[PDB]
Amino acid sequence: MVPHTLSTLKTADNRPASVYLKKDKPTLIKFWASWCPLCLSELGQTEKWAQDAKFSSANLITVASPGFLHEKKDGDFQKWYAGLNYPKLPVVTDNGGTIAQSLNISVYPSWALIGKDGDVQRIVKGSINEAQALALIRDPNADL
């Protein structure tokens, strides 16, 4: 998954995912689903988490796969979500979810770490807490 493709991605705001990749800084992806309530409710927490200084250090964004994983189709989803959360939350939509399929995820929620180079560094399956994020930004080796 070249960084040219990942950066090529686009958000629900028809914005370039590249804007969320640069400064040789780390990037964190979070997969969610509309049919997923816990996720929807997490958005709010993820939106503020993206505003957390601790998190600021790294890039925080979400990824969604339209028509993938029984998830709303493209266009219909962005429109649905367009009426959810605020215009201050990072949302990335990958048709078919090349990254989700590349990592053979197809499971949400999910977290993905992308080295400062823009390559897959570490993949996480499940959910994490604000604290975990800290430990993540502190060290990936961190594990109970």
How far, in Å, CA of 66 to CA of 73, rounded?
A: 4
Partnered with residue 41 across adjacent β-strands are none
How far, in Å, CA of 10 to CA of 6, rounded?
A: 9
CA atoms within 13 A on the CB side of 139: 4
How far, in Å, CA of 5 to CA of 17, rounded?
A: 9
Closest CA to 41 of 89, 9, 74: 89
Q: Determine contact, residues 50/60, Cβ cutoff 8 Å.
A: yes
Q: Determine contact, residues 136/128, Cβ cutoff 8 Å.
A: yes
How far, in Å, CA of 98 to CA of 86, rounded?
A: 26
For the chain, what is the domain count? Answer: 1
Q: What is the CATH number of the domain that holds 21?
A: 3.40.30.10
Torsions phi, psi of 14, nearest 5? Answer: 50, 30
Sheet with strand 120-125: strands edge to edge: 10-11, 91-93, 59-64, 27-31, 110-114, 120-125
How far, in Å, CA of 95 to CA of 66, rounded?
A: 6
Structural domain span for residue 28: 1-144
